[PDB]
């Protein structure tokens, strides 16, 4: 077997030049297909040309920043030194201009929209002030991440809600998610048949959760999910001044659920502070997950708003966390260690597909059983309350009637008009005492009634509300914060870090309240930028 020995020596001799040449050939093939496509017809091939360009730019970009990091840094140092020399007097000029601009925007845009928009700005001040008064360390507050986290949300809103490019971008992005959730029907129509639509939620909606979970596991194997997380976590780290670990877990919670996002920093969890641990739990309570995103879109909830609320919830969570539990210790973990994300144990892309499908088995089982239980309890609670009410000639008493009054101040401060504030309060109740599946199922009913066009009042009962109030409700409800999830959060985190059980249990309730305040902050900014139709 001399030939077998020679072939071996060839490979080990020039392994780097063999495998690199192969990729280069593959790349040339792709580029040949693209250029040929544009030649045959450019307008038809435009989306394939755009994708190719943006990918090339980032590949080049990321390559340059990695090699010329030392040179770029020193080239920026003379400027940073000059600013720190004049910053003692220049800070009052920059602050004064920002304040002036906030006043001008209120006077000339918010005040024009109306009173409900001004009230939304007041709720932002009130929700923030209450977070300070009830802070763990009201004298230790670092105010930089509070003002940057609110400013970033406002900039995102302006771009996305108040410009055509950002509006067109997130309307397009939402329509792609709708098209993508239809592919699950091919799998659902074989396992459950052509009559799979006889059981809509079980045989059509839970397959979407399986498919999206499968896709997310493929993007983590490829390293595309980690590539976006580092980009977003760096913007928040360099503006807000937040620690690397809590910046990475916040950007990851935009796409990943609360029980899986701390795995992005699993080795370094036993050494995080009490404030970083609080931020890790707040970020999970203030966001949702991509696996369940398509389920809410299937109900009839706006895809654009869901995507916008999720992106705005990362800087809101860190701003409320750092104000509800500021940092009194010194952080140990550095940037390089936080940005490295130990990828899973999948040898190929088809093994990553099966691991994501197998992991979805327990998710869809718990979704289904919690909804059977919660909705049976509600039916019982409402029969008991009518039994009791009838003893005072008020058999209308319900869980909805009580929540319409208990949570109505929170909705009014988000800028919902008086009438609809009693209908939004009911949804805050469903989310708080049950979950956001229940709440979003009820909101979708209200959306459908309005689209039909029937009467708004029947026998003095309001049937549906405005579109602005459905928007504000979409942001307020976008989070995994509910009283029953407090134990699966504590347990899952202790499992990753058993040495910290004492600290985890102490920060979990404050983190759930901060999560709710974070989602309400997003709804006040949306409310102050949306007009009244």
Ligand X SMILES: CCCCCCCC/C=C\CCCCCCCC(=O)O[C@H](COC(=O)CCCCCCCCCCCCCCC)COP(=O)([O-])OCC[N+](C)(C)C
Q: Which of residues 293-352 bind Na ion (CB under 5 A)?
A: 313
Q: Is 241 in the site for ligand X (CB under 6 A)?
A: yes
Residue 176 interacts with which of ligand X, Na ion, a second copy, none, CB < 5 to 8 Å by class: ligand X
Whole-number Cα distances in Å, 320 to 16, 149, 515: 50, 9, 8
Question: If we measure between CA atoms, which residue out of 252, 228, 219 comes closest to residue 352?
Answer: 219
Task: Check if the beta carbon of residue 280 is closer than 8 Å to that of residue 331.
Answer: no
Q: How far apart are CA 118 and CA 113, in angstroms?
A: 8
Cα 91 from Cα 89, distance rounded (Å): 6
Site for a second copy, residues 299 to 358, rule: CB under 8 A? 345-348, 350-351, 353-358
Backbone phi, psi, residue 177, to 5°: -70, -35
Interface with ligand X, residue 28, by CB under 6 A: no
Q: What is the 3-state secondary structure (H, E, C) of 48-71?
A: HHHHHHHHHHHHHHHHHHHHCHHH
Q: Among 479, 507, 515, 527, which residue sits at the site for Na ion (rule: CB under 5 A)?
A: 479
- Give the angle 422-390-427 at the CA atoms, nearest 5°: 20
Say if CB 297 and CB 177 are below 8 A apart. Answer: yes
Long-range CB contacts (< 8 A, 24+ apart) of 444-449? 444/299, 444/300, 444/301, 446/470, 447/300, 447/301, 448/300
**Tokens 């929700």, residue located:** 127
Q: Which is nearer to a second copy, 253 or 355 (CB)?
A: 355
Q: Which does 59 bind (CB under 5 to 8 A by kind): Na ion, a second copy, ligand X, none?
A: none
Partner whose binding site includes residue 102, from ligand X, a second copy, Na ion, none (CB under 5 to 8 Å by kind)? ligand X
Q: In the complex with ligand X, which residue's Cβ is closer, 316 or 403?
A: 316
Q: Pick one of ligand X, a second copy, Na ion, none as the site partner of residue 125 (Cβ within 5 to 8 A by kind).
A: none
* Among the listed residues 45, 119, 123, 154, the single contact to ligand X using CB under 6 A: 154
272 vs 286: CA distance, rounded Å: 20
Residue of the chain from 380, 418, 448, 498 that contacts a second copy (CB under 8 A): 380
- Residues 208-247 as x/- pattern, contact with Na ion by CB under 5 A: ----------------------------------------
The interface with a second copy within residues 422-481 (CB under 8 A) comprises 433-434, 441
Is 126 near ligand X (CB under 6 A)? no
| Contacting range for Na ion; rule: CB under 5 A; set: 113-121, 201-209, 281-289, 523-531 | 281-289
Asked if residue 301 lies in contact with residue 443, where contact means CB atoms within 8 angstroms, the answer is: yes
Q: What is the distance between the terminal CA atoms of the chain, rounded to a whole angstrom?
A: 82
Please count the residues of this chain forming the interface with ligand X, following the rule CB under 6 A.
Answer: 28
CA–centroid distance for 93 within its chain:
35
* Of 10, 49, 57, 95, the one binding ligand X by CB under 6 A: 95
Q: Which does 335 bind (CB under 5 to 8 A by kind): a second copy, Na ion, ligand X, none?
A: none
Contact status, residue 323 vs residue 135, Cβ threshold 8 Å: yes
Q: What is the DSSP letter of 196?
A: G
- Asked if 344 and 256 count as a contact pair (C-beta separation under 8 A), the reply is no
- Helix or strand (DSSP H, E) at 461: strand 461-462
Residue 272: CA count within 13 A, CB half-sphere: 30
For a second copy, the binding residues in 74-133 under the rule CB under 8 A are none
Residues 33-52 that bind a second copy (CB under 8 A): 33, 36-37, 40-41, 44-45, 48
Comparing CB distances to a second copy, the nearer of 142 and 192 is: 192
Per-residue contact track with ligand X, 255 to 284, x per CB under 6 A? Answer: ------------------------------
- 49 close to 38: Cβ distance less than 8 angstroms: yes
User: Among 60-68, 194-202, 249-257, 334-342, which window interacts with Na ion (CB under 5 A)?
Assistant: 249-257
By CB under 8 A, what part of segment 190-209 binds a second copy?
190-193, 195-196, 198-203, 207
Give dist(CA 487, CA 501) in Å, integer.
12
If one asks whether residue 227 binds ligand X (CB under 6 A), the answer comes out as no
Residues in 496-525 that interact with Na ion by CB under 5 A: 519
- Site string (1-40) toward a second copy, x via CB under 8 A: x--x----------------------------x--xx--x
Positions that interact with ligand X (CB under 6 A): 94-95, 98-99, 101-102, 105, 141-144, 147-148, 150-151, 154-155, 176-177, 179-180, 212, 215, 241, 290, 383-384, 387
Positions that interact with Na ion (CB under 5 A): 253, 286-287, 313, 478-479, 519
């Amino acid at each position: 077997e001399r030939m077998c020995g020679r072939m071996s020596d060839f490979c080990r001799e020039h392994k780097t030049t063999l495998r690199y040449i192969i990729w280069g050939i593959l790349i040339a093939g792709y580029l040949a297909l693209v250029i040929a496509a544009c030649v045959m017809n450019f307008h038809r091939a435009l989306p394939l040309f755009v994708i190719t360009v943006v990918a090339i730019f980032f590949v080049v970009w990321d390559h340059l920043m990695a090699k010329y990091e030392s040179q770029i840094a020193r080239f920026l140092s003379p400027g940073q030194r000059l600013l720190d020399s004049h910053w003692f007097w220049l800070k009052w000029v920059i602050w004064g201009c920002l304040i002036l601009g906030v006043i001008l925007w209120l006077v000339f845009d918010t005040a024009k929209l109306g009173q409900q928009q001004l009230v939304s700005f007041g709720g932002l001040i009130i929700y923030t002030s209450l977070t300070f008064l009830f802070s763990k360390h009201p004298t230790k507050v670092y105010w930089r991440p509070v003002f940057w986290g609110i400013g970033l949300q406002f900039l995102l809103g302006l771009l996305i809600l108040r410009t055509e490019p950002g509006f067109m971008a997130f309307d397009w992005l939402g329509k792609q998610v709708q098209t993508f959730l239809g592919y699950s029907d091919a799998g659902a129509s074989f396992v459950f048949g052509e009559k799979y639509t006889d059981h809509f939620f079980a045989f059509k909606v839970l397959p979407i959760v399986i498919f999206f979970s499968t896709v997310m596991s493929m993007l983590y194997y490829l390293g595309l999910m980690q590539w976006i997380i580092r980009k977003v976590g760096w913007v928040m780290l360099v503006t807000m001044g937040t620690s690397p670990v809590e910046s990475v877990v916040a950007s990851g919670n935009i796409f990943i659920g609360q029980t899986e996002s701390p795995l992005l920093v699993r080795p370094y969890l036993p050494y995080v502070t009490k404030s970083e641990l609080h931020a890790i739990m707040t970020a999970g309570f203030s966001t949702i997950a991509g696996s369940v995103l398509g389920a809410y879109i299937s109900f009839g909830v706006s895809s654009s708003h869901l995507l916008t609320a999720s992106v705005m919830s990362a800087p809101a969570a860190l701003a409320i966390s750092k104000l509800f539990w500021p940092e009194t210790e010194t952080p140990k973990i550095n940037l390089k260690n936080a940005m490295k994300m130990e990828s899973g144990d999948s040898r190929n892309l088809l093994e990553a597909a099966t691991q994501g499908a197998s992991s979805s088995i327990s998710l869809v089982a718990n979704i289904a059983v919690n909804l059977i239980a919660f909705l049976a309890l509600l039916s019982f609670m409402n029969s008991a309350l009518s039994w009791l009410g009838n003893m005072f000639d008020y058999p209308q008493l319900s869980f909805e009637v009580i929540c319409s009054y208990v949570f109505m101040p929170f909705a009014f401060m988000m800028g919902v008009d008086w009438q609809d504030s009693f209908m939004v309060a009911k949804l805050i109740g469903y989310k708080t005492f049950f979950n956001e599946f229940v709440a979003y199922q009820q909101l979708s009913k209200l959306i459908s009634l309005r689209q039909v066009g029937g009467p708004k009042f029947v026998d003095g009962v309001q049937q549906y509300m405005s579109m602005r109030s459905e928007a504000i409700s979409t942001y307020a409800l976008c989070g995994f914060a509910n009283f029953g999830s407090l134990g699966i959060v504590i347990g899952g985190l202790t499992s990753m870090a058993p040495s910290r059980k004492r600290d985890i249990t102490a920060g979990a309730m404050r983190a759930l309240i901060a999560g709710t305040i974070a989602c309400f902050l997003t709804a006040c900014i949306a409310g102050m930028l949306t007009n009244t139709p």
